[PDB]
Amino acid sequence: MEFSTKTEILQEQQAGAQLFVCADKAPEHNTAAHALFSALEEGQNFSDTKIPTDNGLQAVAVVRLEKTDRAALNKAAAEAAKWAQNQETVNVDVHAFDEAQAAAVAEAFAIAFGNAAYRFDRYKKEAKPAKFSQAVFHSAHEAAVKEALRVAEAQVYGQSLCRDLGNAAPNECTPEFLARTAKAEAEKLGAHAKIIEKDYIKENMGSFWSVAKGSVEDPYLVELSYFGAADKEAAPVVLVGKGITFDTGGISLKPGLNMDEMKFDMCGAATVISTFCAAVKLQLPINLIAIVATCENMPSGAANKPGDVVKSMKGLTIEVLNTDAEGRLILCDALTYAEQFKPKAVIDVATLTGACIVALGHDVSGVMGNNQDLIDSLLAASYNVDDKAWQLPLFETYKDQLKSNFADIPNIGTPGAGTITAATFLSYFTEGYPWAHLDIAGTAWKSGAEKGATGRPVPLLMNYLRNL
Amino acid sequence: MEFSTKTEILQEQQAGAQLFVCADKAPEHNTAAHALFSALEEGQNFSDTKIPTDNGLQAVAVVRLEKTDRAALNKAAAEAAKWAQNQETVNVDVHAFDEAQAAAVAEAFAIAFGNAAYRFDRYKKEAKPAKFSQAVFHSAHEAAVKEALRVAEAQVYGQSLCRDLGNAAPNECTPEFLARTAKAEAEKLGAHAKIIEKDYIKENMGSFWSVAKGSVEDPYLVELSYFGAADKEAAPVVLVGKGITFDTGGISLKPGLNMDEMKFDMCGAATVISTFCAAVKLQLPINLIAIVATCENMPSGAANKPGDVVKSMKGLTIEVLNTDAEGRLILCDALTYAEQFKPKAVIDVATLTGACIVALGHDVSGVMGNNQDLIDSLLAASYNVDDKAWQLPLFETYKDQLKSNFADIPNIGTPGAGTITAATFLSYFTEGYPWAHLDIAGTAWKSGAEKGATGRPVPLLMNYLRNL
Amino acid sequence: HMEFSTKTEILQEQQAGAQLFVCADKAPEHNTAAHALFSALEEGQNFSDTKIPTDNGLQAVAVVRLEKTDRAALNKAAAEAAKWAQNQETVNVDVHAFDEAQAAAVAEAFAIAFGNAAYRFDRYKKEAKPAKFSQAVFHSAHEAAVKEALRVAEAQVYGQSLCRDLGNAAPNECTPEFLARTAKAEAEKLGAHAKIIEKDYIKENMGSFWSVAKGSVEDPYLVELSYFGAADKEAAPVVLVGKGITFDTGGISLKPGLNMDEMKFDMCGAATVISTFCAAVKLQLPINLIAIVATCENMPSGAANKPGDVVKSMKGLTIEVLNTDAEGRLILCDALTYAEQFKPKAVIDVATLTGACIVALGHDVSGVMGNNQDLIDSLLAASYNVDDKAWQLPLFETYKDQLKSNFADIPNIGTPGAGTITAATFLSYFTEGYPWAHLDIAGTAWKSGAEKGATGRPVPLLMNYLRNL
Ligand SMILES: [Cl-]
Ligand SMILES: [Cl-]
Ligand SMILES: [Cl-]
Ligand SMILES: [Mn+2]
Ligand SMILES: [Mn+2]
Ligand SMILES: [Mn+2]
C-alpha cells in the first residue's frame, strides 16, 4: 500500500474511488457525495455508493467526523477502511480541516487503510489479496500530511511484520525462524543484530535454558541494535520480548481447547522486533536495543519438572512450581541480560498471564513497573494513539505471595492477583534500572471468525519512542 | 477495651504490663525494657519478656519504629497487639515522639489493640475472651493523644460491628436481622432509621425483587440518616451497601466447596452500616445517608430463572443471563433509590465479583466510578490508613461487552474484565451523581485458620468521611 | 406486518422506490444502474446494490444472479437480498427472466426471506427499532403462480414470526399459562377451536406429565387446538404434539449455569406446533388437524421430582426417573397417549429433546425418527421441498436393550450412547398405536452468539408436509 498527497480539490471527474472526510458540511462539488452526506441518519457516520460512468462503476463514500478525539477518529477510519480495501485507488479529501486536524485525519485513515489491506494468505492454495493499492490525500497542508503519511507507513509496516510473525504457524515460526527473521529485518533497514546461541544460554542463562531443554528446537537470544541519537553513546532504551513460539505448558500441560492460540505466545517478541524495525524505518533520533529470548515449551522425557530448582542468570534460585508459568523464566534472564547495556529504560512485552484478561479484558493492555515516570510515559503514548493501557500496582505486599522453602523465589505465587504476582516475580530482576512491563495476553490477538494477531501494542510502543 | 491517657513518664514500678514504643534510643529508666531493645536483631522490631516480681510475673515489651510511614506503623502495632491481648493492663510509653508522631502511634496501637481483642464467641458453649481490658498511653501531648484515641475507639467500634455482622451465621443474620440491627445501632447513637418492606420493593424495585422472591426470607431496604452538618439541608454523602445475607447462586447454582464463606456477601452492607455508625459516634460535621438492600439468593420453584427479563426501578429492562450475578441486581435499584437524596457523592460497597481477587488480590480493594475527584478522595483515604485500594478504568469500550437482543442490558457481559464489567453495568444507574464503587470481595474476609470478617474497608471509608 | 403484491408489466426505470432485478444469466435490459451492477459481478458474487442520486432522493437499485435453480441456492440468494431489502420501505422485484415455475419459486423464496428479515423482537426494549420494509411488489407475466406463491409465503412468515415471538419471550413472561392462553387466542382469531385442560385433570390422569410440573409454582396446562377443514369433518386427523417446557433448569439433576438462558427455547416444539397449526388454518388447507401442547416448568424445589422416583404414565407403564433433566420425555409420553383418543392418521411430535442430536447432526439439520417409514419419508420430502434440512435416525429394536430397569417398566434414560435415538425409543413405547414420527429440533430451533434468537424452524418443514397431505 502506497500513500501520496495532492493539493488540488478532489475533482468529481477524478478516476478511482472518491472518499470525502467531512465535518458538518456536505461536500459541495460532488453530486453523489452530497446526496450521501445529506441522507446520513442519526448514528450513521459512513455511507457509500457506486455510480455508473462510462469507465465503469465509480465508488463514492463520505465520512462524518463530529468529534475530534483520536478514539472517534480511529473508529471512523476503521469503518471507511473496510470499504477502502476493495478499491484499487482511493482519493481522500480532507480539505475540511485545518493543518493540525488534516494531518491527524490523514495519519489515522492511512493507518486504517494499510491495516485493513493486510492479508496472511501464506499457506493458502490461492491468494485472495485486497484490491487496495494506493491512497491519495487531498489537502492544502501538504507538508504536515506528508509527515503524517510517513508515520502511518512506519506504523503499518511494524504492525504488518508483527501480525506476520504472530500469525505464522509454530512449525514454521520456530525459535530459529524468529531469530533469523529478526536479524534479516533489522539488517535490511541498516540496523545491527547478533544471535546468541544455545551454548551461552545453557551456561549463563539457566532459567531461560530450563524452559527450552524440553523441545527439539534450539533456543536463541536475539540482540537488535540501533544508534540513531545525536549522542551515539547516550543511554539506550531497551525493549525485551517474550518469544515462546509455542507453549504447551510443558509437564504442567495446557488443556487442548483453543491451544492453537498459544502460537501467539511470541507476540511480545514480535511486538519488540517490529517496533524496533518501525523505529529504524522512521529514523528516530534514539538509541534503541531490542532483546528477544525465544524457545519452545514442550513436554518430553527431559523437560522441566514441577519442583525443579534452577539458577537464573542473576544468581537467584527459582523453584519452578508450575511449568506453564515459563515466560517468567525466560524473561527474567533476558532482563538480567539487559542491564549490561546500562539502559535509560527497559520495557518488556509479553503475553504473560491469562489473569490480565480477567483483570482488564481484551482491549486494554496491563502496565506495571518500578519507575512511575516510565509508566506515565507509556500511558501517555497509550492515550495518544488510543492503544489502551492501564496501570496495575506493584505494592510490596505482593512479594508476600512469593515464598519458597526450597529456593530464593517460587515462579508462581499464592492464588490471587495473578498478573501482579508475575510482574512481582520479574521485578526481582529489574531493580537496577527504570523498568516497565506490558502484559499483552488479551490485546495481542483476537478470536472467533477474525482469529489472528492484532499488531498491538506496536502503536503504543512506537508512539512512546517518538516522544522520547 | 478502654483507652486512657497520662502525662507522666512510665515508671518502672507501675503495676501491669509495660510496653515501650521506641524509635532508635533504648528506654532509659527500665532495666528489662533496656535489655530487650539492646538485644534486638536485624529485622526484629518487637521483643517481650516476663520479669519475676513480688506481685507475680510482669510483662515487659519493646517496639522499634525505624520508619515513619503508616504501613510500617500499622505493622509494628499489629505485632505488639498479638502480645497485648493477653495482658489485662498495658502501659504504653510513647514519650520518644513529638506531638504529631505520638498521636499517630497511639492511634495505630489502640486500633491494633482493640481489633486483636475482638472475639466472636456468640455460638460457643464457653466464651474464651481476651484478657485485654485497658491500655494507658503515656505522653506529654495529652490533647493530641486524647483525640487520637477518640478516632481509634470509633474505628474499632465500627470494625467490630462490621465483623459481628459478617461473622454471624446466615440463619441468624437474616435480611430482617440485618435491617433491625442497623436500625437499633443507628438509633442508639441518636441517628434515624426507616425500614422499607417487601410490598414497596415488589412494586417499585423489580430487579431487587427478582433476586429476593426465590427465598422464604422477606427483603428489606434500610435507610439510615444523620444530619451533623451546620446546614441540615446541605447535600448528603450517601453510602450504598450490598446485603445479600447468603448467596447460593440461585438457579445458576454455586459449587459446594467453600460456599460457607458466602455468608460474607453482606459485608458491603456491614461496611456501610458500621461506617455510618462510626461517623455518628465521631459526631462528624457531615450529612450522611446509608442505604442497604438486603435479601437472600436462594433456589426454589419461584426463583429467578436465566433468561428472565426484569424491569429495574430506573426503568431499564435487565436480562438475567446468570442468576449468580445477582448482587448487581439489588444494587442498581438501591443506586436508583439513592438519587432522590440529591447526593453530593454516592459510594457503594459490595463483595461484587470474584474477578477482583484475580485482578488485585486479597489485600487491595477495587475502586471504579464516574467521578475522578471522588475516586481520588477515596484513594487518598486508602493511603492515609494503609487500607490499600487501586482504581480500575471505566472506559466506554467495556459497555461494548454488555449487549442483549432481548432487554436494554444483560446482567453479565462477554468474558473478560469481570470486575470492570459489573461496575459498567452499575454505571448505567449512577449517571446522575458523582459515584464510586468499592469491590471488597477480596478484602472483606480471610480464610483458613483465621477465617473471619476483616472489617475492611471501614478504615478507608471512615477516613474519607473525616476528610470531607 | 409485511405485504406482497403483484404486477404484470416490466419494472420500469422510473418506478419510485427500491428496485431489485432477480436475473439469471442476462443483465437487466432497460435499467442503467441495474445493468451496470450485473456487469460488474465477480466470480462468486451474486448480490450487488447501489444508491443512485435522483431528484426525489437516493434510489436503491440491486441485482441478483441466480445461476443454479435448486431451492437451497434460491434460499441463499434470497437471504442475502433480504439483508438489503429490510432497509428499503418499498421493494419492486422484477422476475421476468424466469418461466412460470421458476418465477413462482423465486417469489416464494424472496417473499419468505423478506418477511423473516423484517422480524424484530423489541418487546422489552426502551425504544423499538423496527425495519423500514413494508411492501414487496413482484413483477411477472405469471400472475396465478406468483400470487399463490406469495400466499404460501405469507402463511409461512406468519407462522415463523409467531413461533419466534413465543421462543424469544423471557421465561417469566412466557409462562405455561401465557403459552396456553396465547395458543388459544391465535387459533380462535383464525376461527379454529381450542380447549385448555388444567392441572386437575393432569394430576389425576397424566402422572408422568404431572411429576415434572409439581416442582414449580407455575401451573401446568394441556392445550388442544382443532381445525376440521377436510370435506369429511370426521375423517382421521393429523395430530401435532409439542413439548412446552417454558424453562428447564434440570430440576434436582440441575444443569450447569453456562448458557442456561437458552433453555427458554425448550418450548419451541410447542411453538412450532402452535404456529404450524395456525399457518395451516390461515392457508385454509383441506385437512383435519389437531395440535396438542403440554406445557409446564421444570424447577428444583422441596417438592420436585427426585432421581429414582417411579411414576405411572397416562398409558400405565411405570417410568423410573433416573435423571430429572430428561423431563421432556415425561411430558411428551403423556401427550402422546392423549393423542390416541383422536384415532389419528399420523402423529408428529416436535421437541427440543436432546443435546445429543446436535452432536449427531449439528445445528442446521433436524433429526427425524418414527415407527412409520412413509410418514418419515413424507417429512423428509417436505424437508427437501423448502430446504429445511432433516435426517432420519434409525429406531432399531436393539436400542430398546439400553432401556432396562430393575424397578419400573422402563427407565427414562438409557445406557450411554445414541442419546437421541434412546429418547425416541422411550417415546416409541407410547406411540405404537398410530403412524408416528418425531422431530428433534434441539439444534435447529435457535441460534447463539451475536444473532441469538429463535429461528422458527421447523415451521417451514412442517407446513410443507401439511400442504402435501
Ligand atoms: Cl508466564
Ligand atoms: Cl454480583
Ligand atoms: Cl428430554
Ligand atoms: Mn505459559
Ligand atoms: Mn453472586
Ligand atoms: Mn431437560
mmCIF file with all atom_site columns, N, CA and C in Angstrom, chain C residues 78-79 109 140 145 166 203 206 209 249 251 295 319 375 412 426-427:
data_model
loop_
_atom_site.group_PDB
_atom_site.id
_atom_site.type_symbol
_atom_site.label_atom_id
_atom_site.label_alt_id
_atom_site.label_comp_id
_atom_site.label_asym_id
_atom_site.label_entity_id
_atom_site.label_seq_id
_atom_site.pdbx_PDB_ins_code
_atom_site.Cartn_x
_atom_site.Cartn_y
_atom_site.Cartn_z
_atom_site.occupancy
_atom_site.B_iso_or_equiv
_atom_site.pdbx_formal_charge
_atom_site.auth_seq_id
_atom_site.auth_comp_id
_atom_site.auth_asym_id
_atom_site.auth_atom_id
_atom_site.pdbx_PDB_model_num
ATOM 1  N N  . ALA C 1 78  ? -31.865 -15.390 -1.769  1.00 0.00 ? 78  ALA C N  1
ATOM 2  C CA . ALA C 1 78  ? -32.936 -14.581 -1.202  1.00 0.00 ? 78  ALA C CA 1
ATOM 3  C C  . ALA C 1 78  ? -32.553 -14.031 0.167   1.00 0.00 ? 78  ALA C C  1
ATOM 4  N N  . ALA C 1 79  ? -31.845 -14.822 0.975   1.00 0.00 ? 79  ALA C N  1
ATOM 5  C CA . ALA C 1 79  ? -31.446 -14.336 2.294   1.00 0.00 ? 79  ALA C CA 1
ATOM 6  C C  . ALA C 1 79  ? -30.470 -13.173 2.179   1.00 0.00 ? 79  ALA C C  1
ATOM 7  N N  . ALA C 1 109 ? -39.518 -17.757 -2.347  1.00 0.00 ? 109 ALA C N  1
ATOM 8  C CA . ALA C 1 109 ? -38.310 -17.709 -1.532  1.00 0.00 ? 109 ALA C CA 1
ATOM 9  C C  . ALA C 1 109 ? -37.948 -16.279 -1.144  1.00 0.00 ? 109 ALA C C  1
ATOM 10 N N  . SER C 1 140 ? -44.269 -9.863  -12.869 1.00 0.00 ? 140 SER C N  1
ATOM 11 C CA . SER C 1 140 ? -44.188 -11.131 -13.579 1.00 0.00 ? 140 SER C CA 1
ATOM 12 C C  . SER C 1 140 ? -45.371 -11.292 -14.525 1.00 0.00 ? 140 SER C C  1
ATOM 13 N N  . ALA C 1 145 ? -49.488 -18.121 -10.648 1.00 0.00 ? 145 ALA C N  1
ATOM 14 C CA . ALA C 1 145 ? -48.466 -18.879 -9.941  1.00 0.00 ? 145 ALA C CA 1
ATOM 15 C C  . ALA C 1 145 ? -47.760 -18.018 -8.907  1.00 0.00 ? 145 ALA C C  1
ATOM 16 N N  . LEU C 1 166 ? -42.848 -16.578 20.428  1.00 0.00 ? 166 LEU C N  1
ATOM 17 C CA . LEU C 1 166 ? -43.031 -17.437 21.588  1.00 0.00 ? 166 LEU C CA 1
ATOM 18 C C  . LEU C 1 166 ? -41.690 -17.930 22.114  1.00 0.00 ? 166 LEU C C  1
ATOM 19 N N  . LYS C 1 203 ? -52.958 -33.820 36.988  1.00 0.00 ? 203 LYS C N  1
ATOM 20 C CA . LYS C 1 203 ? -52.517 -34.535 38.179  1.00 0.00 ? 203 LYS C CA 1
ATOM 21 C C  . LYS C 1 203 ? -53.218 -35.877 38.317  1.00 0.00 ? 203 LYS C C  1
ATOM 22 N N  . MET C 1 206 ? -52.494 -37.773 34.152  1.00 0.00 ? 206 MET C N  1
ATOM 23 C CA . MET C 1 206 ? -51.227 -37.663 33.437  1.00 0.00 ? 206 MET C CA 1
ATOM 24 C C  . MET C 1 206 ? -50.092 -37.595 34.464  1.00 0.00 ? 206 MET C C  1
ATOM 25 N N  . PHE C 1 209 ? -46.550 -36.505 33.160  1.00 0.00 ? 209 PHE C N  1
ATOM 26 C CA . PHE C 1 209 ? -46.604 -35.061 32.944  1.00 0.00 ? 209 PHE C CA 1
ATOM 27 C C  . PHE C 1 209 ? -46.566 -34.319 34.272  1.00 0.00 ? 209 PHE C C  1
ATOM 28 N N  . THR C 1 249 ? -34.565 -25.908 34.108  1.00 0.00 ? 249 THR C N  1
ATOM 29 C CA . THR C 1 249 ? -33.346 -25.841 34.906  1.00 0.00 ? 249 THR C CA 1
ATOM 30 C C  . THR C 1 249 ? -32.676 -27.199 35.065  1.00 0.00 ? 249 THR C C  1
ATOM 31 N N  . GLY C 1 251 ? -34.064 -29.425 37.207  1.00 0.00 ? 251 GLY C N  1
ATOM 32 C CA . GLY C 1 251 ? -34.600 -29.937 38.455  1.00 0.00 ? 251 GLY C CA 1
ATOM 33 C C  . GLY C 1 251 ? -33.518 -30.327 39.442  1.00 0.00 ? 251 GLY C C  1
ATOM 34 N N  . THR C 1 295 ? -47.468 -28.121 28.535  1.00 0.00 ? 295 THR C N  1
ATOM 35 C CA . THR C 1 295 ? -46.564 -27.072 28.974  1.00 0.00 ? 295 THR C CA 1
ATOM 36 C C  . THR C 1 295 ? -46.502 -27.006 30.493  1.00 0.00 ? 295 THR C C  1
ATOM 37 N N  . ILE C 1 319 ? -42.465 -45.499 34.948  1.00 0.00 ? 319 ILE C N  1
ATOM 38 C CA . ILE C 1 319 ? -41.211 -44.927 34.474  1.00 0.00 ? 319 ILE C CA 1
ATOM 39 C C  . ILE C 1 319 ? -40.344 -44.628 35.683  1.00 0.00 ? 319 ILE C C  1
ATOM 40 N N  . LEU C 1 375 ? -44.469 -42.069 6.820   1.00 0.00 ? 375 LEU C N  1
ATOM 41 C CA . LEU C 1 375 ? -44.573 -40.778 7.486   1.00 0.00 ? 375 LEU C CA 1
ATOM 42 C C  . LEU C 1 375 ? -43.219 -40.081 7.533   1.00 0.00 ? 375 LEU C C  1
ATOM 43 N N  . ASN C 1 412 ? -36.288 -43.653 32.356  1.00 0.00 ? 412 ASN C N  1
ATOM 44 C CA . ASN C 1 412 ? -36.453 -42.507 31.471  1.00 0.00 ? 412 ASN C CA 1
ATOM 45 C C  . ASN C 1 412 ? -35.190 -42.176 30.681  1.00 0.00 ? 412 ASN C C  1
ATOM 46 N N  . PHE C 1 426 ? -37.623 -44.467 24.032  1.00 0.00 ? 426 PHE C N  1
ATOM 47 C CA . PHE C 1 426 ? -38.509 -44.276 25.177  1.00 0.00 ? 426 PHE C CA 1
ATOM 48 C C  . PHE C 1 426 ? -39.897 -43.839 24.724  1.00 0.00 ? 426 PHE C C  1
ATOM 49 N N  . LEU C 1 427 ? -39.955 -42.812 23.873  1.00 0.00 ? 427 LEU C N  1
ATOM 50 C CA . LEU C 1 427 ? -41.236 -42.314 23.393  1.00 0.00 ? 427 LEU C CA 1
ATOM 51 C C  . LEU C 1 427 ? -41.988 -43.367 22.594  1.00 0.00 ? 427 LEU C C  1
#
